[PDB]
Structure formats: structure tokens, C-alpha cells
């Protein structure tokens, strides 16, 4: 009991709000490259150059068994899936006005936080293993996604313990 019932919303908000940076900004990776060689960084859809004549220039980036793995890497779906899962978990924890005090939705809410978690393990490993296909280093959007994963793993357990407090404690 206590206030901790409400901190679910703070945990969810923090878990969700970070993710938007990942699904498009170019700060995933530092390397040399081209905007056609020059210091470069690249997003999923685009690429930009720095410290040269192309400083501030940008271009599209593209990829068109390994064929299916290339397709999965280029569609990058796990970001979107985890985003939808986190959002639907937030919409679940909001459910104060139906199933009142049974809160079957609050029971279900853990599924989203877990699945959004497990999503990003595959997402990361696909992203890294394909991009590796040496001075290079990982850009901060990778750390942002990892941090979002950390808070998602926090809030899932927290929310499940809060369902245990609010309802399961009454069932014995």
C-alpha cells in the first residue's frame, strides 16, 4: 500500500518517453563514411557527414538467409513493436474506471512491459550483428534505448507487485 500505487504512472512515463530518439536520429554510430571519405554518422533512414566539405550535408541510406536478415534489419520492426507495447501498457495502467477493483487490465498490464523488454534484446542483437557486417564506437541513442529497457524492466516488476498489493493480497 501507500503512494507506490501511483508511482506506476511515473515509471511508465519514463519508460516510454525516451524511445522516440531511437527510431530515426542518426546518432547510432560514429565512423568514417561518405555523403556521396569523411567522418560520418548514420540513422536507419538517412546519413550525415561532419568535419569536412560535406559538414552538415545529409543523404538517404538504404539496403536495396541473408536476404531475410537484410529485410528484417531494414524494416527494424522491434522499435515500433516495443513502442506500441509500452504505450498499450500505459493505457492499461490508466484503467481506473472499468473492472473497478477487479482491475483485470491491471493484471494484464505486465504482459506489455515484459514483451517490450524481450523485443529489444533481439532488436539490439540484429542491429549490432548486421551493422558489424577499429576506432568505431556506439552513439548515445544506443544508450538511450538501453536505459529505456532498464526502466521498462523496473516498471514491469513494480506494476506486477502493485497488482499483487491491490488485488492478489485480497485473494489469498
Amino acid at each position: 500500500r501507500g503512494v507506490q500505487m501511483l508511482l506506476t504512472t511515473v515509471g511508465a512515463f519514463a519508460a516510454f518517453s525516451l524511445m522516440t530518439i531511437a527510431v530515426g536520429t542518426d546518432y547510432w554510430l560514429y565512423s568514417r563514411g561518405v555523403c556521396k571519405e569523411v567522418m560520418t554518422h548514420s540513422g536507419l533512414w538517412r546519413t550525415c557527414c561532419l568535419e569536412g566539405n560535406f559538414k552538415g550535408l545529409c543523404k538517404q541510406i538504404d539496403h536495396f538467409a541473408e536476404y531475410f536478415l537484410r529485410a528484417v534489419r531494414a524494416s527494424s520492426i522491434f522499435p515500433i513493436l516495443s513502442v506500441i507495447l509500452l504505450f498499450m501498457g500505459g493505457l492499461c495502467i490508466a484503467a481506473s474506471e472499468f473492472y473497478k477493483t477487479r482491475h483485470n487490465i491491471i493484471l494484464s498490464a505486465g504482459i506489455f512491459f515484459v514483451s517490450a523488454g524481450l523485443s529489444n534484446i533481439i532488436g539490439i542483437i540484429v542491429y549490432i550483428s548486421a551493422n558489424a557486417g577499429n576506432s568505431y564506437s556506439y552513439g548515445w541513442s544506443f544508450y538511450f534505448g538501453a536505459l529505456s529497457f532498464i526502466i521498462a524492466e523496473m516498471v514491469g516488476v513494480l506494476a506486477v507487485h502493485m497488482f499483487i498489493d491491490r488485488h492478489k493480497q485480497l485473494t489469498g
Binding site: V114, G117, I121, E153, G156, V157, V160, T171, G172
Partner: protein, 200 residues
């Protein structure tokens, strides 16, 4: 006698964390994520409705502890008894079974090839690791001496020196030793032994 000079090879100075070096940073970073990831599901499944908590001791804290011992091959005080509880344990072991075996395999790599090296010796060795370059003082007696000799071990050395580029000849001994100091390995120089053990 005609004698050989090379750069002193320096000595090993391991970094204190070098015990990680056989295995890549990404591996550890993925291990840590897996070690977290396995705990949350193992908990959540273990406290679905018995309908009583003595039905399943495997709460959050215990669902952490169980994973650590399983990752270290040190077992447990308790193990799950549900089907959906057990299956994760029935998977998590295999990951450790692979990865520690790979870590041992790579730990054998450096400890082998390294003890497989040998140095330069006897001048004859410069027939084989030929990418460590060598040459002579220019226009001096030794340069013509290599041309005039006709024994195969020297015939190779001459045949190389007669064609190598960039220039394998130096105007002075000072330029030679400077060149050896500059390349810091990968280069070797020729002169009379009386000068050699003087520079030494």
C-alpha cells in the same frame, strides 16, 4: 665479421584488465542483458494464481538468486516445479554451457600461437620472414661482396636487394641506425661486427 643489427624488441606490459581480452566487450554487454531478461519472466510465471504462497517460493528476490547460481554452475537451494516455470531453467543452462566453453577455447588461442614464435637468428632466418626488410650500406665493400658471392643463401639476399623498392641503401651508418630507430622493428641493417658491438 659481417654482422646484423636489429631493434631491441621491448617487453610485455599487460593491462590489468587483460583477462577480458580473449572475449569481446559486446559479449559481456549482451550477457548482462540476458541475465536481467531471464529473471522477470521466471518470476512472473512463478506467481500466477494457485487458486497459498507456499505453493511457489520463487518470488522476485528468489527469482533473481536462482539465476545467478545457474549462471555460475553452482546450482541452487530451490528450483521451480511448474511446467512453465521449469522450461526457462531448461533453457538458461545451455547458454552458459556454450559461452564458457567458447571462453576457454579462446583462452587457449593466445596461450598457444604466442609460445609458437622464435626470433632471428643466424642470418639464414631472413630467407623466410622476408617482410622484415633489410639492406646494406651503399657503395661500400659489403654491397659488392653480396653481388660477387654465389652461394644460394646469399644469392637470395642479393636477388632481393638487387630489386627491392623503396631504396634499401643508405649513405651513412648514421642514416642506417637512424632508419632502424625510425621503423622500430620491421627493418634490419648490415655492417661490420666491430661497429655493431660498439653501437650496442
Amino acid at each position: 665479421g659481417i654482422s646484423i643489427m636489429i631493434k631491441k624488441p621491448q617487453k610485455s606490459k599487460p593491462g590489468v584488465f587483460s583477462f577480458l581480452d580473449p572475449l569481446a566487450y559486446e559479449i559481456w554487454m549482451c550477457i548482462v542483458f540476458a541475465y536481467i531478461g531471464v529473471s522477470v519472466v521466471l518470476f512472473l510465471v512463478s506467481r500466477f494464481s494457485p487458486y497459498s504462497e507456499s505453493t511457489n517460493e520463487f518470488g522476485i528476490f528468489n527469482s533473481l538468486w536462482f539465476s545467478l547460481g545457474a549462471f555460475m554452475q553452482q546450482g541452487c537451494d530451490i528450483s521451480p516445479r511448474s511446467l512453465s516455470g521449469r522450461i526457462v531453467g531448461g533453457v538458461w543452462w545451455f547458454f552458459t554451457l556454450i559461452i564458457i566453453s567458447s571462453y576457454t577455447a579462446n583462452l587457449a588461442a593466445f596461450l598457444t600461437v604466442e609460445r609458437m614464435v622464435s626470433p632471428i637468428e643466424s642470418a639464414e632466418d631472413l630467407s623466410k620472414q622476408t617482410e622484415i626488410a633489410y639492406g646494406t650500406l651503399d657503395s661500400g665493400s659489403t654491397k659488392e661482396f653480396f653481388r660477387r658471392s654465389k652461394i644460394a643463401v646469399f644469392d637470395k639476399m642479393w636477388t632481393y636487394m638487387r630489386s627491392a623498392e623503396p631504396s634499401v641503401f643508405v649513405r651513412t651508418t648514421a642514416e642506417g641506425v637512424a632508419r632502424v630507430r625510425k621503423s622500430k622493428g620491421k627493418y634490419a641493417y648490415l655492417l661490420e661486427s666491430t661497429m655493431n658491438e660498439y653501437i650496442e
